[PDB]
Subunit: 92 residues, 2 copies
């Protein structure tokens, strides 16, 4: 797994995951951006950045949030980071 | 889909009946994200293809057994799915979703 998914899990459930939240947890873990959402998110970053300053997880989270209008998961952020990497955009 | 979640949720409730403490997040995520390597997928599909003729749709049980022999431990839902998907890429009759 990616390090930030584990970080995301500690952030979301700082004192443990109670059994009443198992469905919510797994549903969130399963969630991903559609191809069209990944295109829009990467586009949004490219529109707002110069290609020198490395793009941060926070930058990507904000771009994705604006698009899906809800708190992004680590997996969603990573889809966009991957896409930006495919066009050589610097990543933090 | 619904069945994927049914299966993982059933597993989670059984493995962690009183909750998942933060010390077990590493182990939990490792299991949830565990996947067959490409070469393991190839080997599973090949063993299944050798022992079936299409008159009997490949079941979850068929795939589970094939993957178990390869990885030498109980296969997860995602590992089973990877093989079902590979089999579907050659149009092999499947009982299970993908």
């Amino acid at each position: 797994f990616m390090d930030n998914v584990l970080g995301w899990l500690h952030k979301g459930y700082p004192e443990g995951v109670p059994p009443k939240d198992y469905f919510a947890l797994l549903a969130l873990l399963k969630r991903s951006l559609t191809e069209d959402e990944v295109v829009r998110a990467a586009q949004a970053i490219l529109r707002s950045t110069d290609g020198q300053s490395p793009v941060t997880d926070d930058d990507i989270r904000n771009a994705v949030h604006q698009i899906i209008e809800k708190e992004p998961t680590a997996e969603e952020i990573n889809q966009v980071a991957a896409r930006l990497a495919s066009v050589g955009w610097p990543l933090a």
